[PDB]
UniProtKB/Swiss-Prot annotation, chain B:
<dbReference type="InterPro" id="IPR050705">
    <property type="entry name" value="Cytochrome_P450_3A"/>
</dbReference>
<dbReference type="GO" id="GO:0005496">
    <property type="term" value="F:steroid binding"/>
</dbReference>
<dbReference type="GO" id="GO:0030343">
    <property type="term" value="F:vitamin D3 25-hydroxylase activity"/>
</dbReference>
<dbReference type="GO" id="GO:0046222">
    <property type="term" value="P:aflatoxin metabolic process"/>
</dbReference>
<comment type="subunit">
    <text>Interacts with PGRMC1; the interaction requires PGRMC1 homodimerization.</text>
</comment>
<comment type="pathway">
    <text>Cofactor metabolism; retinol metabolism.</text>
</comment>
<dbReference type="GO" id="GO:0042572">
    <property type="term" value="P:retinol metabolic process"/>
</dbReference>
<dbReference type="GO" id="GO:0101020">
    <property type="term" value="F:estrogen 16-alpha-hydroxylase activity"/>
</dbReference>
<dbReference type="GO" id="GO:0006629">
    <property type="term" value="P:lipid metabolic process"/>
</dbReference>
<dbReference type="GO" id="GO:0008401">
    <property type="term" value="F:retinoic acid 4-hydroxylase activity"/>
</dbReference>
<dbReference type="GO" id="GO:0019825">
    <property type="term" value="F:oxygen binding"/>
</dbReference>
<dbReference type="GO" id="GO:0006805">
    <property type="term" value="P:xenobiotic metabolic process"/>
</dbReference>
<dbReference type="GO" id="GO:0034875">
    <property type="term" value="F:caffeine oxidase activity"/>
</dbReference>
<keyword id="KW-1133">Transmembrane helix</keyword>
<dbReference type="GO" id="GO:0005789">
    <property type="term" value="C:endoplasmic reticulum membrane"/>
</dbReference>
<dbReference type="GO" id="GO:0002933">
    <property type="term" value="P:lipid hydroxylation"/>
</dbReference>
<keyword id="KW-1207">Sterol metabolism</keyword>
Length: 452, 448
């Protein structure tokens, strides 16, 4: 099974028996994809254990996998487990079950539903400032993924359930404590190492009631939703019930995906943005000059005022270029196809290296440098939407893209209106990415906060 | 009563006595709303006779009228008469009668009931192609609304009653096309407006706007169609608190809407596809990709076609067949920072908002890329309202969108459309009452 790409004439690193090419992950998925992109070119193949993975970098071929042949061939992602009841999660569901859940949860993030969240999100933006004002009036360096994480959890628990959990913190809020340990794919752990190298034990662990998400975390989330479901305004929890009037299980599964996504992805990218704004004070000042122009006298940010800020979107877009927290896009080829003049066998996992494409010198000038001017309307036209895919593409893209982009901008504004950010020497410069599994910094992002 | 907007400080054209502002309708409702939107920015008021009409364009205020305070203040549309037994129609009913009829007729267009209609609709799509193949093998220019209307009547009479009607000269299409034509030159719907206080006279006089020998003919056909689950069956089960009349009133609305709205928009779409062959070809390339070897369109393959939805959405932007949205303010309110008196008709100029330069780049041009997933997030759902919004929105929106798409697929799979010189280019909209072309849409049909 390790002679598939040798047969197809597709280059790639020589796989070791059983392991495949997983030993090359010692520097992370990023550095492995960047090296393979330069070593073999537009298309290469490798093996995660006994599983062949074909990597494509052609925009037309990426457009075919993500959009053109999504419903017919490239519908599902790589099988993930053991998940237990989480198999019904929208990000894990396959084929028919995903198509029903995608249409059920699509009206959650419309332009109207999002516009209803702006007055609600505006509350915790002040709690975010008041919590930062305490750590700013006393010169105390600030870890950001904590103060950004507490704000993100308050938004997702209210925009989707209408409940207030962290009521001004409450820094040991149980949701944030449990959600931060819902899952950390560490390749050092021999669990996830075996899960990939040896994939036939997943049915063993499924009947063994084993779950990658710790039982103490799922329970706390499983019983909180049953606590949140007691008897409106029409949000994520409401859409599921009015159509349930689904099950008590699949309803909990989708809530866990929304709670994690709204917390981890929002807080991590916000920490990546503030690091770039601190290391580039010229960009931070120019961004502060635009916020004061659209919103004078520290005016509260509204739905339309956020979409007007051109430079705020450029800072968000450039940071998502350097740090695509998804790293990769994966689709499982469900049947034999010949896309763009290339045969792809059934079962092959088609992977799009987003991190490698976002830093390809053949597309970006000085790819390692933070330059928000890449996304200006003077130059945003010179960017392929299939090379820069921070939220994916096609029918199975990021469903909370418009919500995540709005909320992050609502937090950036209401912060940069009151504070400027400076490094602290105890701040890691340059920022090392996590050489482990997920895209995070090695040392947590710390920065000095000064009040304006 | 002509100093209401002068009192409230709301701008608007100076009304003439009795007439009000109706003599500005000489260019149509659409050109009157576009001019008033540019001169009387954001909010303006005018009079349809002695009836004050407040026009709003703010998305937050439109959302408040159509959605938030719909059940409480803005529940009913403008009063219309004389109507007779048609007062029990869902689109004419008011307050309690509408709420019961809206809940009664809503399950007609669920995702399951619509999915049941695809195998039935797929029959007349072949008859639509076979009737077009005769007028295509001979080089005869085709009147699109004629061949599109015969298909629309077959669908509504089977999806709602289960009867097969159109095989040429069909009595249903012939009568339904005459059911109502609001012509402002025509002096009845006119005086009805300048003089709305004689509507009661003609009521106790048994008089109506829909021709007697059109209503009778629809009135006896339903009694003929009722002999022993669809739109018809849903009501007889609640009759066994509908009556032998209110059931007939709802059937007339479903038959008219399923015929005129479907055929007219389908004609508007094929005109834009013939005047923009690049969009027509690009749409044909997507249909052959989702449905290879001319595969029959099913429920799921229709919702997959992204470009087909973008073409339908852009055509509905340029030609919103309803033109306006109207709600009657039933009690004094102060919405979004503006006082509105009781009895004022709140109007949303859909045609004017769909072509507003503060919202659309080159609004007069046909660009389906406005509704691509990349850009459709620039579109306010309260500016682009081809089916309205709120609890009293278009109840047959999901049915009309599938039916038109099911017809566009089967037609574009077999034929390409070209102008015929005798085709009106550019297309003039009807300067009269309803949104239609002046000259009928004629195009050349070539077989692939
Ligand atoms: C900076 C913030 C975020 C980024 C960069 C991001 C990125 C992504 C990407 C790249 C994908 C996969 C797309 C593909 O495979 O083509 C994805 C999927 C998904 N995202 Fe996000 N996301 C973010 C925030 C959020 C938020 C706030 C939510 C809230 C619910 C969310 C929910 C989801 C879900 C449910 C999926 C799976 C969709 C499916 O399988 O159909 N994401 N995200
Ligand atoms: C392209 C096709 C169509 C368009 C653009 C359209 C548009 C509209 C609009 C704008 C309204 C007014 C909504 C409001 O005032 O908020 C409406 C109402 C209505 N439509 Fe249509 N429509 C179409 C086809 C149909 C079809 C096929 C039916 C089949 C039954 C239908 C039945 C109705 C009914 C019954 C109402 C009144 C609902 C009520 O008053 O509660 N329409 N439509
Ligand atoms: C490399 C690792 C093992 C880390 O992840 C995977 O391999 N597990 C998925 C298959 S289920 C996945 C399971 C999950 C649930 C909660 C927290 C974390 C993990 C899931 O539910 N995820 C969406 C959760 C919320 C979210 C996150 C980020 C952005 N938006 C929303 C496959 C996958 C690999 N990379 C991806 C990038 C995007 C989407 C899916 C994947
Ligand atoms: C400018 C004029 C006077 C022409 O029209 C109005 O002012 N009279 C209505 C108040 S009753 C209206 C009466 C009616 C009934 C059958 C056929 C035609 C007319 C009615 O029931 N029509 C719905 C029939 C089904 C349908 C048609 C089109 C699209 N979808 C469904 C006010 C009104 C203005 N625009 C509208 C759009 C939809 C519904 C009502 C209105």
């Amino acid at each position: 099974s390790h002679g598939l790409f040798k047969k197809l004439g597709i280059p790639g690193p020589t796989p070791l028996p059983f392991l495949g090419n997983i030993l090359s992950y010692h520097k992370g998925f990023c550095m492995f994809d960047m090296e393979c992109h330069k070593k073999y070119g537009k298309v290469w193949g490798f093996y995660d254990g006994q599983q062949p993975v074909l990597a494509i970098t052609d925009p037309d071929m990426i457009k075919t996998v993500l959009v053109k042949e999504c419903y017919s061939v490239f519908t599902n992602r790589r099988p993930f487990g053991p998940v237990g009841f989480m198999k019904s999660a929208i990000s894990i569901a396959e084929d028919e079950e995903w198509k029903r859940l995608r249409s059920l949860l699509s009206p959650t993030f419309t332009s109207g539903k999002l516009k209803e969240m702006v007055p609600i999100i505006a509350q915790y933006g002040d709690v975010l400032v008041r919590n930062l004002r305490r750590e700013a009036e006393t010169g105390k360096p600030v870890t950001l993924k904590d103060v950004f994480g507490a704000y993100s959890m308050d938004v997702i628990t209210s925009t989707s359930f209408g409940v207030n959990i962290d009521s001004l913190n409450n820094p040991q809020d149980p949701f944030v404590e449990n959600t931060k340990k819902l899952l950390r794919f560490d390749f050092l752990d021999p669990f996830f190492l075996s899960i990939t190298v040896f994939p036939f034990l997943i049915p063993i662990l499924e009947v063994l009631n084993i779950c990658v998400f710790p039982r103490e975390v799922t329970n706390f989330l499983r019983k909180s939703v049953k606590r949140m479901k007691e008897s409106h305004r029409v949000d994520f929890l409401q859409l599921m019930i009015d159509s349930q009037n689904l099950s008590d299980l699949e309803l909990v599964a989708q809530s866990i995906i929304f709670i994690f996504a709204g917390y981890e992805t929002t807080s991590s990218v916000l920490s990546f943005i503030m690091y770039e704004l601190a290391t580039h004070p010229d960009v931070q000042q120019k961004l502060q000059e635009e916020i004061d122009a659209v919103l004078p006298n520290k005016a509260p940010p509204t739905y339309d005022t956020v979409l007007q800020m051109e430079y705020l979107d450029m800072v968000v877009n450039e940071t998502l270029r350097l740090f695509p927290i998804a790293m990769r896009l994966e689709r499982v080829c469900k049947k034999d196809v010949e896309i763009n003049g290339m045969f792809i066998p059934k079962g092959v996992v088609v992977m799009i290296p987003s991190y490698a494409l976002h830093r390809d010198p053949k597309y970006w000038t000085e790819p390692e440098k933070f330059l928000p001017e890449r996304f200006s309307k003077k130059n945003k036209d010179n960017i392929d939407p299939y090379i820069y895919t921070p939220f994916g593409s096609g029918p199975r893209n990021c469903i909370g893209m418009r919500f995540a982009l709005m909320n992050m901008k609502l937090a950036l504004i209401r912060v940069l209106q009151n504070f400027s950010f400076k490094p602290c020497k105890e701040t890691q410069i340059p920022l090392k990415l996590s050489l482990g599994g997920l895209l995070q910094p090695e040392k947590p992002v710390v920065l000095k906060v000064e009040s304006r």
